[PDB]
Design a protein around this ligand. Sequence first.
Ligand SMILES: CCCCCCCCCCCCCCCCCC(=O)O[C@@H](COC(=O)CCCCCCCCCCCCCCC)COP(=O)(O)OC[C@H](O)CO
Ligand code: HEM
Ligand code: HEM
Ligand code: HEM
Ligand code: HEM
Ligand code: HEM
Ligand SMILES: COc1c(O)c(C)c(C/C=C(\C)CC/C=C(\C)CC/C=C(/C)CC/C=C(\C)CC/C=C(\C)CCC=C(C)C)c(O)c1OC
Ligand SMILES: COc1c(O)c(C)c(C/C=C(\C)CC/C=C(\C)CC/C=C(\C)CC/C=C(\C)CC/C=C(/C)CCC=C(C)C)c(O)c1OC
Lengths: 126, 248, 385, 385, 93, 93, 57
Amino acid sequence: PQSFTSIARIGDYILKSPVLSKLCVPVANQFINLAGYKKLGLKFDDLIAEENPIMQTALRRLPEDESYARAYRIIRAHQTELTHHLLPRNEWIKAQEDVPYLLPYILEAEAAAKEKDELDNIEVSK
Amino acid sequence: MTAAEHGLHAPAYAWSHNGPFETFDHASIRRGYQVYREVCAACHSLDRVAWRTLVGVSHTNEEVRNMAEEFEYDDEPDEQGNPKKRPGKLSDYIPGPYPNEQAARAANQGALPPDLSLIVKARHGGCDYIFSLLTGYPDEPPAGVALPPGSNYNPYFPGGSIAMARVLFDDMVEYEDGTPATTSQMAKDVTTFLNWCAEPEHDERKRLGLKTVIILSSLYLLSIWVKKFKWAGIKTRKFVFNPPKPRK
Amino acid sequence: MAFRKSNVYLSLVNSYIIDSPQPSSINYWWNMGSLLGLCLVIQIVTGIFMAMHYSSNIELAFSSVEHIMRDVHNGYILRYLHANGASFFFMVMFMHMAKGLYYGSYRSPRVTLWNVGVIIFILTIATAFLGYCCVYGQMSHWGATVITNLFSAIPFVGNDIVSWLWGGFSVSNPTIQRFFALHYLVPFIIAAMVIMHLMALHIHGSSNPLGITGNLDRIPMHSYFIFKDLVTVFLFMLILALFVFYSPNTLGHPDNYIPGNPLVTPASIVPEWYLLPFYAILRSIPDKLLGVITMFAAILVLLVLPFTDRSVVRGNTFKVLSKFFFFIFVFNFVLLGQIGACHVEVPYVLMGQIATFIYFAYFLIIVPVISTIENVLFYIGRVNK
Amino acid sequence: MAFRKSNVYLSLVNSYIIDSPQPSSINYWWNMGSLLGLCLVIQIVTGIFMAMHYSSNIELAFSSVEHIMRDVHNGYILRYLHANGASFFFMVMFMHMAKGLYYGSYRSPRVTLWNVGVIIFILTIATAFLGYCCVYGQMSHWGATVITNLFSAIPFVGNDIVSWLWGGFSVSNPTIQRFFALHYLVPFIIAAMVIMHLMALHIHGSSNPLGITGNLDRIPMHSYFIFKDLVTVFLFMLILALFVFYSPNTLGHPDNYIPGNPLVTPASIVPEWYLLPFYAILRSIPDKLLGVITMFAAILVLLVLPFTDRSVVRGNTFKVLSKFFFFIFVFNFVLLGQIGACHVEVPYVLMGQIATFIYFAYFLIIVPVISTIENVLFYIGRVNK
Amino acid sequence: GPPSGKTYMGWWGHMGGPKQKGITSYAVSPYAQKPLQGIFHNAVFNSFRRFKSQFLYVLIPAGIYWYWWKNGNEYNEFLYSKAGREELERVNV
Amino acid sequence: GPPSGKTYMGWWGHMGGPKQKGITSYAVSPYAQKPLQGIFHNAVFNSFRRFKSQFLYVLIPAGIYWYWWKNGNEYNEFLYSKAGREELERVNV
Amino acid sequence: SFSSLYKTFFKRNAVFVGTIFAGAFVFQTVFDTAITSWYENHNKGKLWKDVKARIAA
Ligand SMILES: CCCCCCCCCCCCCCCCCC(=O)O[C@@H](COC(=O)CCCCCCCCCCCCCCC)COP(=O)(O)OC[C@H](O)CO
Ligand code: HEM
Ligand code: HEM
Ligand code: HEM
Ligand code: HEM
Ligand code: HEM
Ligand SMILES: COc1c(O)c(C)c(C/C=C(\C)CC/C=C(\C)CC/C=C(/C)CC/C=C(\C)CC/C=C(\C)CCC=C(C)C)c(O)c1OC
Ligand SMILES: COc1c(O)c(C)c(C/C=C(\C)CC/C=C(\C)CC/C=C(\C)CC/C=C(\C)CC/C=C(/C)CCC=C(C)C)c(O)c1OC
């Protein structure tokens, strides 16, 4: 459990800072493409846990095409890992195809739930 | 810790009873019994095992009964309540000169003699440990070490001094052959007999273990084949994704 | 409603054994947990046979153990099976915990299962010590007295509680008899709490090595996983046969085989191999009561382990720094066990204290910060606009 | 949904204990079953606490209870409560079976309950007989010999099974050790089958004294029937305490408090009171295997009662004379036990055959003809053409 | 029988996972196959590939802790050897 | 949990009893009741009625079996009181 | 090569259990005998069978 709004804040802090971002972005992408989920044909959004109710709320708003593609990717990953194999460099997710299709819904749901729970337990102090 | 009293490890010797497909050399246990009883009689107790396991592996039918008749075992009192003396049975336990324990500590000029029925596993190492302890001690302590008056030395044994009287002189065993009168033969005999007494099931244990490992290896290979068989229809199924038509 | 599922007695088995939707990505690590359960019940049944053929009185306790060793058909096999089964039971418990921790199975869906397992461990180490006490050798009752002196460190009262627990200032028939009775009884609580553990498991399901949802595909446990359990238990039984027949008394230590005589302790006294890291965590901290409470904190830190890992992605397969530090942790654990095996002198004390420090620092600090770094790196690397 | 029904353990507790739509016409007879369950639980607890300070040795068994009486604090309480609770358990068990029989609780939706109950009855026949054989008193050895030699009449196998039971070729240490082990263990089997019994009942529900459907009005178990169970168990505890504290030599027989010695013994050897109904019947037909097969018949007649009678109206409350014959049967049961208490002689020996004949005849021939007659009388009375 | 608590996964027919369409499977009986068609290729190539993949995270901590243990052992052995009467007294202060 | 098999009853709300309509119940909040005032009289009347409805069912069988046991015992005194010397022969032969 | 003679033997179920158990019993007996014989003949002299003749004159 860790709020995605804090992640977005740190990300925007890093992205507009020249020297630190220039130092940390090549190691960042090198870590991403050495992680290994790229080979299994997985997008990043398919990996983050989908159990606590806020993630379920985010999932329920996805257009049907994305949900179908996600289900296929999960099934194919399960089948591929069952045989301990890896399909060759044809199903491999390309470098720029790992775009987050699920971040905006997560951020909107985070903001809505956070302000709901903040204003629910509120005081009338000036 | 400090190796001075930690005890240097004895090298792994080669025995007749250290291996996967072996038995006790119980053609010498009939000799180990004699070597034990001739010298260690009034030295230790060993009083833990019975004579029902001493028949068929070290003595055949009769000498065990001769030994039973040889000694008195303090029978039940008669109708007058007076004590008596009786021959021993074939289901009794190996006796000892001490009544129960009192006569031991009085004559040892020091400590008590540990029960040899379990000394084989009572120390680290094992079969070779007792051999090294009874062989490696010199007749003279290392230079600069003045032992307490009346105590001997043993570098292998952690402690560097024992109340053991070094009764290991040769030339007075001579069963019926030329085998005795050298320390190695009697040392091997005593260590094999002590190992047998500590575990009088080695042959049966190894036979049952061989049968068990054979049957479990067969069962394991069988399970391998069947698991690879009935999972073949699920480890090969292929999925094809056709995107649906764009209409909710 | 066929006969299998309509009948309630057969329906209970159907929901558990005959049909249960496990995922299809299960590795060879969950049948290890099933193997844990089966070796547990094997230990229970051989314990029942022992209790059938065992006497606990001091005048006959060693007599009873040597009689079951020697003067009964298939007797020594029972003792060897007990020893090897206990050793394998703790080894497989450690493997189960490692699998649970590495794959992120302590997360929100089965937190309750995690605490149930933690308390199972907390009381099964106790019952293992209690069974170790029942031997009544030259080191078993010795360690029992050690543990009684340890428990005597309760603040504000030192004598009444220890006298009540230990049956007076001496040891007699009631003390050893009650110790044997409680070593007999606690595994029944183990069985009941394991029943609760399986109930929670069946309610909440099972996780996957991929650390992702498993509801997409499922297969029945019977006819697919029953034979995997069969092959893994056949392998376990082959290994157990190898260690029970060819070399039975190797995992244990050559100290228990002495008749009851708490007069002169043997030169080499060490705890059983499944307790060395905790002996190390006790020895490191230079305080008695604080040492006991830090042992208990080391045992119970798994309770506070959840809601401390703020890594968004479940598991540790796709994260490299976290699994590197996890391997550092497990090797630190084995190093702690090894250093606890040896004696206490310079410079072992310094590196043992360092090991305990990095252990607790690992748990309380490093996983949160490295997980936060992992999440922020995940966010920054993908987004290039 | 409330959290009480959310948590799995709490949900099970609520659905099985707190909330249960029991019928609204329940008398004390139905609370008698819960009272018996509580008696069984307290019996297990007090037995466990008794065996903790007990020795399983043959020569240290009677000495063990002697040491409990004379040395341990409140030693008499445990054994007195154990014995009187066993006797009360058996009496309340007979009451429970009679209540089930009279109110027509053996109908189609409860045949499984009847079967599991009669299985509990079968095992309960011996689970305390062997417990009494454990004590090794002045008729305990005789009871052990009777039970071990009843099975010797089986053709082509008469010595192997009795040798297995004897732990040899006679009665020695293996006999008493096995007796104690099984008397300890098999109550856990009782626990298993009573969990099964309660599971089946909770699946199907209880019945009504009226004999009509009870699915009209129900009240929850908690705060309504808990008080009835509480008052019943309070009354039971009061009477049990008064007997155990004031009249110890009332339920049990003063025969077992003498060391086992087949040298001098009186002729006043008779089994405990609850054996007499199934003991007088054995002495009627004069053969060896005939006694065993007629015990089998006398324990199977309780099983043949379902789909035997032809009473379309459940119960006996609203039948003109069937309750009268049921009372004839219960008084015949009591008289058969009492006449079995007396030794064999004319005319009591002659009374044995006729008593057994009536005992079996009610089960076999009386119920169907009386049910058919009652049904036809109802049909002729209700209609006029 | 009252319904149980709300859980993401349930029984057959109500897994709770997202509704999906367009997925096609293709199974075939184990009888019409070779049960060990590729055991050697697996146990050699895939085993070596997995070992190489995991060869970047396991051996480093083992090696560093092995060096630590060996260095401690060397220090212990050197301390109690021709230094215990002059070096061991100035380390136990 | 999962649905069960065939049953003649359910849980609260869907027990399965016959459909009925037109029944009204009441209650008087047992706090404001003062429940028992004639408990002894109520017990006396209930015991009287319960005994009145069950005259013979308890008196007759016990009486007949007491008579049977009395007959057996009196035959015993005709035999087993200084009299067996001249009737045990005809009993046993 | 699997003729009808062998095909017919793969249809009985009610009686096949008893004969398969008897075959298992026979197999375990012969296997025990063979293992005992091999353990006997893998070690001569050490065992107690021939020490009777060794001590015999
Ligand atoms: C010098 C040692 C000799 C040992 C001789 C006895 C053991 C013989 C084992 C079989 C012959 C060797 C064949 C070459 C190695 C095969 C290893 C392997 O991966 O093959 C299969 C292994 O088969 C198993 O199921 C093995 C279960 C392993 C259990 C857990 C690991 C324990 C250690 C196993 C090796 C050692 C076994 C004996 C230990 C004493 C495939 O795995 P799978 O069936 O799970 O399928 C997964 C996937 O499809 C990959 O293709
Ligand atoms: C006859 C030859 C003997 C043999 C084979 C023998 C064997 C042994 C063995 C194996 C031990 C224990 C070694 C170990 O620590 O594992 C031992 C110890 C001992 N023996 Fe002997 N022994 C012999 C003679 C004697 C004699 C004659 C005495 C004196 C009466 C004696 C008294 C003792 C004592 C007192 C100990 C214990 C020492 C201690 O506690 O420090 N032994 N012996
Ligand atoms: C999973 C549970 C258990 C574990 C881990 C366990 C562990 C142990 C251990 C380590 C020993 C020491 C024996 C040795 O060192 O040789 C032991 C002894 C013993 N245990 Fe357990 N035990 C368990 C359950 C039981 C049960 C259920 C019983 C039931 C009676 C039991 C009875 C005994 C007895 C009688 C001994 C002493 C016999 C001997 O020394 O050979 N144990 N146990
Ligand atoms: C000692 C007795 C235990 C038994 C018989 C047992 C049994 C099981 C079983 C059957 C499972 C389902 C997966 C598998 O088969 O492994 C499981 C899962 C699990 N257990 Fe245990 N367990 C025990 C102890 C523990 C303990 C002490 C812990 C504490 C760390 C624990 C934590 C877990 C976790 C986290 C899972 C999740 C695995 C999955 O994702 O399904 N268990 N256990
Ligand atoms: C719930 C079923 C049980 C019944 C009906 C029962 C019955 C009896 C009876 C009647 C006696 C004394 C014999 C006599 O005075 O007539 C006895 C003794 C005893 N029972 Fe049980 N018992 C039961 C369960 C247990 C259990 C679970 C234990 C557990 C340890 C136990 C332990 C003992 C002990 C220690 C004694 C002392 C005398 C003896 O050795 O038999 N009993 N039991
Ligand atoms: C001695 C061990 C027993 C225990 C602990 C036990 C337990 C119970 C319990 C708790 C109930 C619930 C009572 C109610 O519905 O309020 C019950 C009911 C019942 N039992 Fe048992 N029982 C036992 C023996 C038996 C036996 C031997 C039978 C006969 C074979 C039997 C047949 C029944 C029946 C028919 C009911 C339903 C009563 C009704 O609905 O009117 N039980 N039992
Ligand atoms: C996660 O997926 C699952 C899964 O869902 C399940 C259910 C299981 C099944 C779980 C288990 C097999 C483990 C459960 C463990 C137990 C039930 C322990 C049982 C404990 C006991 C004490 C057994 C009780 C038995 C007795 C009390 C009888 C023993 C007494 C005897 C034999 C008396 C002997 C005396 C005489 C005279 C014969 C899995 O293995 C599994 O992984 C694939
Ligand atoms: C269906 O409607 C119901 C109904 O719902 C219920 C609950 C009951 C009531 C049923 C019962 C009371 C029977 C339940 C009994 C059991 C489940 C027995 C289980 C208990 C045990 C097996 C033993 C209990 C174990 C302990 C108490 C562990 C503690 C014991 C010891 C020795 C440890 C303590 C020692 C120390 C040193 C701390 C009914 O009778 C009933 O019908 C009306």
